[PDB]
Amino acid sequence: RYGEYFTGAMGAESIQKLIENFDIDAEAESLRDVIRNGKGQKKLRALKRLKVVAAFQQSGNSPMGMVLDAVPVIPPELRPMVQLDGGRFATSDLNDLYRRVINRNNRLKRLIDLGAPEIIVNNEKRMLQESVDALFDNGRRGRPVTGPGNRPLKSLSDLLKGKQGRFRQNLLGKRVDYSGRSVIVVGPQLKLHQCGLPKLMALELFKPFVMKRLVDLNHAQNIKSAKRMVERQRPQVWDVLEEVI
Amino acid sequence: IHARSTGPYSMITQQPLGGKAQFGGQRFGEMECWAMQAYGAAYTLQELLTIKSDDTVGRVKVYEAIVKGENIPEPGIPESFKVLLKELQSLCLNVEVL
Amino acid sequence: DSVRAYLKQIGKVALLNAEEEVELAKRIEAGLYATQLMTELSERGEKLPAAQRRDMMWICRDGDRAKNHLLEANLRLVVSLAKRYTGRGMAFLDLIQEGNLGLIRAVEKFDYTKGYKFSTYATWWIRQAITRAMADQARTIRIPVHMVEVINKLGRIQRELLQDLGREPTPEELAKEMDITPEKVLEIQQYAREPISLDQTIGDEGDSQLGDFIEDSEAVVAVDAVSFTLLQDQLQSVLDTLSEREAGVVRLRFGLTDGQPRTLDEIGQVYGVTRERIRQIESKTMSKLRHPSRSQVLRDYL
Amino acid sequence: VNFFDELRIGLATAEDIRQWSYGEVKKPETINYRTLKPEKDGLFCEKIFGPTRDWECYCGKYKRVRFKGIICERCGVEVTRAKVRRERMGHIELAAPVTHIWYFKGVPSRLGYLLDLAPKDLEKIIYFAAYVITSVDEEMRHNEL
Amino acid sequence: ADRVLRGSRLGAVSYETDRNHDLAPRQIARYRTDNGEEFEVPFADDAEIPGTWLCRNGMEGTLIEGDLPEPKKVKPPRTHWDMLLERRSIEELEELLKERLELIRSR
């Protein structure tokens, strides 16, 4: 009764519709006017709102980007699945979130086909919304999805946040190759630009260089024989190491 | 006394890794990076950060050069930067290099 | 929490009694029959009088209305039955939705002439659908239904056996018990276990994860990568010292340059010879290579 | 390219997300349980993400390096370096719209200002707890009044 | 258990050398989806080109040529009418259609 005159909706589709019938320039002009004349706790709100309104208006953005209609899926090797000896699979947790999303999406897609009471389709769409929310940022809205052990699964955002994310990666330091360590003593006969170095550690650090430099002088048939000779500590190497150090 | 030229690497994170009969690899921490920067030595820092810890296509490409006696390829942009873009785009964030 | 909003929403619906669904089923079938007759009228054309069509279309609408009414009336039974399948493999709402699908199936496959309580027949479907779900969508690595049956059977058998014996049974024991060989029961046991999560901290403080301790058993050794190219080049050098033909003969035989081997006659196809004229040359060239001078440079790459 | 000047961020329109993928996934399957190989059309799929074995298709009609850049007409799996399973993305075509949470459940809720709705009133709408008016035909609602 | 437990990947790695010359020749086809899309797909030179292709878009597309071999073999999905026809005889339904009809005709 009276429906033919207006239109109503619910959920993300309703919000997308609202954003479609949204004129940004008019809202920006209206906020300009409100900040021009008004004052008190009516120009602070106006100015705040105008902040994001202008953020959307200036650049070549579009509010349509805030309502998803196609969800990307990260490459497989960024959520690996590796088989620990004994035939035991170990994987990330994003697999379960993607599986929940896809299952609920397919279930809604099938349920729409048959056609069913609105009471069910709405619950299904709400479940799908909550699944996507748990995917992008777990624990934000509601109680976080948890796996065996009643622990929260690491969502996509956890790839960037915390001291484990990509941003905080190169800052926390990382162990490197061609390195060693040892106890120190005094070298009172060394010059200011020299230092002692145990021949074993020198022969381990410089293994590739000596491996090469003992191929020119035909002390080994090929790089493989050279590597074997070096790992065996043959007498020939000690002459080359002094030339490469 | 320890040392490591090239040993085993962890599978999940490609940083070096050792055990009983494995070298292990030394840890170039943070204050060491601060000192390196205080020297202004950019190439040494990047080398300690890229072709010695994670960049799998860099470690082998430098080992081959060394063993063949060619020049060590100039450190470019690591491959650990074409993964941040994907991890972002997985959030519907369109980041473009200008 | 949405489980509460859903319970609230379902509550508002009014339950049904003995004979109400008796009438709803009649209305459903009448609407279906009128819809079917629709096509008969479409082909036979002759759109009946305004009322002759309007009344039938209203009866059809009544069909869908009654169907939705029954679905809403039984949603509560669905939830009541599905509220005791939780804690293992699936979320409460997914079970509720699978039960709703099962109830739709039941209502589609219900009969009102047999004179039975609707719930009695609906329970079968509402339980089967939930079980098939828990079987299909409960494991990261999917396992077909027939295997899940044997897995659950073996789980229950092992539970009962440990209860009676009061201790952990043995594989061969159940194999003798479950009418299968010990190898088959060990295989099913293998399939039983679920993948290990790769995130939780490793049992203590607390920053390192289970990931940084996995050493690949097939890692890409750099020395081998460098060695392969040198091996190719050394093969090329060694084969460049033989006859003009024998080099290409051996190559096409082992498929070095092109990449695909060739049969004995296939190579001679371009050399105008037959099986023997090719095989003799190939063998003699192999004997040539076996010479110490040739194998001195290659023996190490092996 | 080794020449950077900036690094710009922006929202991804729904028309881009489907312009990055190499296929749409439609089965929540990771790998077969007995043969340990990626399923078809599911996660880990080899036709939409890449080959699991260097220069090898799924069926196995092309194995060596001689076949690069070509696509097996049986399993549609392009043959190339197995390191492309670390650069290809897929997508999922949702059966109904879904709002990015970073902008609704934040502080301040970006939509709350873009649309001027109370956050506790927007949550009711986007979680199917209340209806919302999306358009009114003032013309007819005026004359037909 | 913090230790060195060795696992393994799924796949394989070959130390073969990339080469951009002397590779098998290929042939390109141009399939097209239902919503007017153009997708180019390579194929082996000596390969049986297929008739339909699950395109990058996500929906099956036909070729650029005019083969149009067969849109057939489809099987209609078991609907509610088939399930009613199973457990019911037309006559009964017909009779029912009459009775309820009267109720609406007689209000």
Next chain:
DNA sequence: GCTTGACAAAAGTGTTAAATTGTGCTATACT
């Protein structure tokens, strides 16, 4: 240097049986 002849082991090729996997179904009442 090169062919013919017989000749045997290997690989297709086609067919048929086994197992494998997916789908439908079960009617006291239970909300």
Next chain:
DNA sequence: AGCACAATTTAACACTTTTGTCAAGC
């Protein structure tokens, strides 16, 4: 659970052609 049945994939076996082999000779 459990069963009943259909569709699909894997294996097993006969058989025929191909591919490698040796003896001989010219």
